[PDB]
Amino acid sequence: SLAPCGLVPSARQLEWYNREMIAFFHFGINTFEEYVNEGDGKASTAIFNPTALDCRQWMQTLKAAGIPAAILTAKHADGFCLWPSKYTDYSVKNAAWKNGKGDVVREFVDACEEYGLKAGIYLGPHDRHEHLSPLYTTERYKEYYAHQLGELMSDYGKIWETWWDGAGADELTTPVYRHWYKIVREKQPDCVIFGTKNSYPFADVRWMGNEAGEAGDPCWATTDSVAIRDEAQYYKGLNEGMLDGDAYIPAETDVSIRPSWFYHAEEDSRVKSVRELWDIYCTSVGRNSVLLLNFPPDRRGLIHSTDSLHAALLKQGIDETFSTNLLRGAKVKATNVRGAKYSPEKMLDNEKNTYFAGKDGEVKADIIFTLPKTIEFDCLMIEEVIELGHRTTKWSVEYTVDGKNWITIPEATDKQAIGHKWIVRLAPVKAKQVRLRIQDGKACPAIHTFGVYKQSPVF
Numbered sequence: 001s002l003a004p005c006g007l008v009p010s011a012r013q014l015e016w017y018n019r020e021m022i023a024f025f026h027f028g029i030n031t032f033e034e035y036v037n038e039g040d041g042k043a044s045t046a047i048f049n050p051t052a053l054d055c056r057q058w059m060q061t062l063k064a065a066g067i068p069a070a071i072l073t074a075k076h077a078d079g080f081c082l083w084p085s086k087y088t089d090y091s092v093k094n095a096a097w098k099n100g101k102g103d104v105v106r107e108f109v110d111a112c113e114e115y116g117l118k119a120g121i122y123l124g125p126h127d128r129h130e131h132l133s134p135l136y137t138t139e140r141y142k143e144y145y146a147h148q149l150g151e152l153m154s155d156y157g158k159i160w161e162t163w164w165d166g167a168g169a170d171e172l173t174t175p176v177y178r179h180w181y182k183i184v185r186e187k188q189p190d191c192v193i194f195g196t197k198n199s200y201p202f203a204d205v206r207w208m209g210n211e212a213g214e215a216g217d218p219c220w221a222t223t224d225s226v227a228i229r230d231e232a233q234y235y236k237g238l239n240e241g242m243l244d245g246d247a248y249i250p251a252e253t254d255v256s257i258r259p260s261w262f263y264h265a266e267e268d269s270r271v272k273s274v275r276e277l278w279d280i281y282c283t284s285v286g287r288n289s290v291l292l293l294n295f296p297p298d299r300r301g302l303i304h305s306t307d308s309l310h311a312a313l314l315k316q317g318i319d320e321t322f323s324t325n326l327l328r329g330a331k332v333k334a335t336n337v338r339g340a341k342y343s344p345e346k347m348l349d350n351e352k353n354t355y356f357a358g359k360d361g362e363v364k365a366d367i368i369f370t371l372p373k374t375i376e377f378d379c380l381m382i383e384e385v386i387e388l389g390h391r392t393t394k395w396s397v398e399y400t401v402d403g404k405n406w407i408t409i410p411e412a413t414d415k416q417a418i419g420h421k422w423i424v425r426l427a428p429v430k431a432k433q434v435r436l437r438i439q440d441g442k443a444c445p446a447i448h449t450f451g452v453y454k455q456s457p458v459f
């Protein structure tokens, strides 16, 4: 069989990559303040009062959108806790909501379980509320957070992601996070950790340097762990990563479907269009990353219908786009073929476990797909066998109509990364043959999938 090349993903990282999309839910005391996205920790707990909370309605939105996981803000930097923790009074325990007898996190994980969605927790490292205590020290806070982490990792079922926002967290040192890490890893062994700054040695996935929904081109799963730590001076190290990076810590791309992270009625006219979301999908999922897309629940405790509709149409457009691989039915010829078991046709078979592979030592390959009828396409996708590491580092796609003139596709010329998935949109071409050029790499190519497609009219 093939041996892996360089650093490889863990089982958690594979599971995570396979989600492709994750939902964020920013919900809390901010929602009940007027135009606030970052709370000071001084709002009265009494104002938290969703009129008819319905997390099931959130899950129905995610079903409609094709999204298999969700992360809730159990506590944002304002420090207000959405579950009745035994370790603070600054929580739903003292809200007007349900006379202080509610538990949003409970309703969230119960709804996730009922709909078969993976649940995840955002629990803010920087806590502005705790900072207001004249008795605050980093060491006491470390124990405070650990107790709360212990509640959320013990009493709320299986947790698939823990999110550590690096905003305001520079005071928190590595031994602090180590303590937190052991609790998470021991109680929830499958839980992916989104690690920032001083949490770097414990991170399963990294930030990619912006909140616009654009991972780098290229975007390597690998990078130097120091890039995560010294976040502010390594934008490209996070956004693009490094082929010779010392750690396998792939990029998770986060973006709100609205201008703000929290809900504001004024932004109902500002929800990202289906086309914007499609661009974002292509610059995240389509760039060897994973898209974490925020839907902020409102004061009733519902997801707004424009947010729902646009996410649902994105899903519809994706399904139509990629339902027919227009290369299927082709006659396939390739140089550098490891064997029949790894024939280039495996790129076209829609099977989970098969792939095209080259011969050891040989990093280049040329694969020509000759089509029964001339086709028209404006999109292409390629997927590497990531269990075997980043192998190919330069690739291009070409076509011809007359059989003699190979024409380049400008958008798909001298690309570098493949990884989990790379998507390229291009001006519409007609073609009788399509050539896939694997031009360079660290090891022989190993490719699960290759296809060309016609983008949905929805886009």
Ligand SMILES: CC(C)S[C@@H]1O[C@H](CO)[C@H](O)[C@H](O)[C@H]1O
Pocket (backbone or CB within 6 Å): 164, 165, 166, 167, 168, 196, 197, 207, 210, 211, 231, 254
């Ligand atoms: C400048 C702001 C984006 S702060 C930024 O937020 C990111 C999440 O989007 C990560 O949590 C970073 O660690 C944090 O510094």
